[PDB]
Design a protein around this ligand. Structure first.
Ligand SMILES: [Zn+2]
Length: 197
């Protein structure tokens, strides 16, 4: 399949992502590394991602998340769940069983299997922040480990978050690497220690 662009594009609304401050305790379930621009998370656990805008986009704006393989040799392959997890019957009633990325706690979620590129993505309406908040948080879940055989096969992925109009035109784009693993805290610490040493 054709490779969706990963180029950062803040756009006219100044679209940026934010992440909670987490540490590297071995018990942590999701932890973001600013140095690596990389989220480390466990399978099927909440991954909060904050949407920040400098100006409010118009009604009908949407927020799409899509995984792509980070390495050039794998970029043209659609990111999918492994057959074992696809068949394990763990859906929430809406997410197709093959989709890696789910959204939890959103009544207006839509799951797309692109009719032409076969890529999967998950989209929700953009909602402005509520009273007292400065950003909007989406709760993602990743439904396979990076190591799953027949799925990610130990290959790193990026998540691309796009702000789009109702018709799919690009308003903004950001991305971050993801590792889905048993012990995100240890893996983040190891990768950061390797980076800094
Ligand atoms: Zn799997």
């Amino acid at each position: 399949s054709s490779v969706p662009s990963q180029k950062t594009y803040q756009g006219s609304h100044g679209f940026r992502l934010g992440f909670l401050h987490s540490g590297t305790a071995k018990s942590v379930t999701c932890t973001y590394s600013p140095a690596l621009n990389k989220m480390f998370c466990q399978l099927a656990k909440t991954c909060p991602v904050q949407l920040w805008v400098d100006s409010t986009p118009p009604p009908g704006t949407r927020v799409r998340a899509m995984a792509i393989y980070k390495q050039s040799q794998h970029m043209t392959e659609v990111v999918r769940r492994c057959p074992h997890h696809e068949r394990c019957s763990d859906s929430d009633g809406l997410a197709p069983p093959q989709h890696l990325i789910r959204v939890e706690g959103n009544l207006r979620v839509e799951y797309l299997d692109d009719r032409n590129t076969f890529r999967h993505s998950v989209v929700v309406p953009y909602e402005p922040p509520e009273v007292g908040s400065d950003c909007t948080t989406i709760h993602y879940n990743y439904m396979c480990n990076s190591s799953c055989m027949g799925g990610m096969n130990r290959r790193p992925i990026l998540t691309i978050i796009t702000l789009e109009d109702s018709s799919g035109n690009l308003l903004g784009r950001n991305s971050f690497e993801v590792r889905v693993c048993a012990c995100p805290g240890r893996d983040r610490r190891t990768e950061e220690e390797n980076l800094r040493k």
